[PDB]
Structure 1
Amino acid sequence: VPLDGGRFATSDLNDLYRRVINRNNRLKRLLDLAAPDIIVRNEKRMLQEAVDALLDNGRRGRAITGSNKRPLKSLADMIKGKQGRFRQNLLGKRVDYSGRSVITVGPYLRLHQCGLPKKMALELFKPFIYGKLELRGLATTIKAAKKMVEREEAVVWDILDEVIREHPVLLNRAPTLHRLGIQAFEPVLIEGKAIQLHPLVCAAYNADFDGDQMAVHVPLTLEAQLEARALMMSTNNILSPANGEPIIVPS
């Protein structure tokens, strides 16, 4: 945890190790000194307190510090948290090739499609574009490609269309309650900053247009694209896999 002006400050977990080391060295020093059983006794006490405080700051009372206190955190607290390395590694990675914008209505644009804001793809699809650029021969090297999409002129928008064609994207909203809450679509590039969502699916998403926001994600690979076509496209599932009765119903 490096500071604003330099001169690194100690993290939370380090304090526990520093403390244990101090009491370990002091108990060793008084132990090798051949001294009375009272004071080395209190050192045994103090060190069990120290190691037990480095493994769990609970177990008994106070723990913390004079730092503004708070229980601090320990190696136990490094896990089992509402949000932690376990939570981060569990269904919960924060993620890549993603973005998010506001929703508007889609009132042409057939069911399996999705108005995706022009500016916003071009990012999501970067790797893909550079590939095409190197194929056509417009860039011999990666830096060239890179520079032309940075300059974002001309051929690049033309190639973007070619990249996006038939490549299914997937949109996701908010509390995802049921599996419908994420679905997959064929994008259609549209100048704008917002995502146009066809009406009929507004049901499923439980979304109105009062400033709701959608995330967007890009399947890569092949397997993933096919799982998007043959599973999550909105035209596969029109019926609610609870009651069984149609969703998609016009409102």
Structure 2
Amino acid sequence: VPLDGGRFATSDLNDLYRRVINRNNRLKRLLDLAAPDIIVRNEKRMLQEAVDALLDNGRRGRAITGSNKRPLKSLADMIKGKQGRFRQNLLGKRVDYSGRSVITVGPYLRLHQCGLPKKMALELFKPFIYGKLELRGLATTIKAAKKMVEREEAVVWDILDEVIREHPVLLNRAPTLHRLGIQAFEPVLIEGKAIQLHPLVCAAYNADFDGDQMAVHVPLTLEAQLEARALMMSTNNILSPANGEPIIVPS
């Protein structure tokens, strides 16, 4: 692919394949020319080397390196290990409708609630806002709805307030060691950029407010929303699944 600045950027595989093709096509030439057998041999070894590099580089011997010194990334490296397909892109994924911020206390909150910054919530619920805008007849089209939310009009705040009622959101803190590291709450919209977390579930998150941050996720479907409110809501999940003990305890 071309970078903006007229540079090109390519996969290492292309370099590896260029080696193989060149060596194989040279072999065909050497055979057409009926070359002496020692040269035929060297080329056959050459071919095997390049193929081995293509499939799994640093397996048989010295991995074939770039100008950077670093061994080129072969096919097997894309399947193999943490950088590999499975671990990195398949068993765990990047996710839309996800946000993050600093967390701070919400002593006023009840157990099933969390402070959700307005700005953040406006973006997370974008399509829900556009859909409701079209039912209000406020937005003629999607382009108009978009421009209406950019301008952040006062009717949009009323609509946003409407949508987020009864809609659970998931809060997560890293590392997610047990299931209670992800819990669902009813969001309470707040002006100001930090998430407010309820004190009593700080236990389960191991959250202390020395600058800790948390991630927010929007359950989209009726099914996911139900899963969140029923299975994952903080009020519903009190006891440690490990020992039969209440994990929400005053501290």
**TM-score normalised according to structure 2 size:** 0.96
**Following the alignment from structure 2 to structure 1, what is the Cα–Cα distance between the partners of residues 90 and 170?**
21
Q: Within 1, Cα distance between the matches of 2:9 and 2:141?
A: 44
> 2:26 and 2:191 mapped to 1: Cα distance?
70
8 Å Cα contact 1:112/1:234 also seen in 2: yes
Is residue 111–residue 235 contact of structure 2 (8 Å, CA) maintained in 1?
yes
Tell me by how many angstroms 1:3 deviates. Answer: 4.3
Q: Quick one: structure 1 residues 93 and 158, their matched pair in 2 at CA, closer, same or farther if it must change by over 3 Å?
A: same
Unaligned runs of 5+ in 2: none
Between Structure 1 and Structure 2, the one with more helix by share is 2
8 Å CA contact 1:173–1:215 kept in 2: the answer is: yes
Alpha-carbon displacement from aligned partner over 1:167-192 (angstroms, at most 9, x marks no partner): 00010001000010000000010111
Instruction: Indicate the RMSD between aligned Cα atoms, in angstroms.
Output: 1.3
- The alpha carbon displacement at 1:118 in A equals 1.1
Structure 1 alignment gaps of length 5 or more: none
In structure 2, the CA distance between the partners of 1:139 and 1:208, relative to structure 1 (3 Å rule), is same
Which residue in the other structure is 2:184 paired with?
A: 184
Deviation at 1:145, TM superposition (A): 0.8
Q: C-alpha displacement at 1:10, in angstroms?
A: 4.3
Give the distance between the partners of 1:88 and 1:59, measured in 2 at CA.
Answer: 22
Q: 2-side partners of 1:114 and 1:58: how far apart? A: 50
After TM superposition, the structure 1 stretch with the greater mean CA deviation from structure 2, 206-215 or 90-99, is 90-99
Q: 2:81·2:87 contact (CA, 8 Å) conserved in 1?
A: yes
Count of matched residue positions in the alignment of Structure 1 and Structure 2: 251
CA contact (8 A) 1:88 1:94 kept: no
**Structure-2 change in CA distance of 1:4 and 1:89 (3 Å):** closer
Quote the residue 1:196 is aligned against.
196
Q: 2:205 maps to what in 1?
A: 205
Does 8-17 or 176-185 show the bigger shift? 8-17
| Whole-Å separation in 2 of the counterparts to 1:230 and 1:9 | 48
Taking the aligned partners of 1:9 and 1:182, their CA distance within structure 2 comes to: 39
Partner SS, residue 152 of structure 1 = coil
Q: Once the two structures are aligned, what percentage of the paired residues are identical?
A: 100
SS at match of 1:122: helix
Q: Aligned-pair distance for 1:140?
A: 1.5
The answer to whether the Cα contact below 8 Å between 1:183 and 1:234 also exists between their aligned partners in 2 is: yes
Secondary structure at the residue paired with 1:30? helix
Report the CA distance between 1:153 and its aligned residue.
1.2
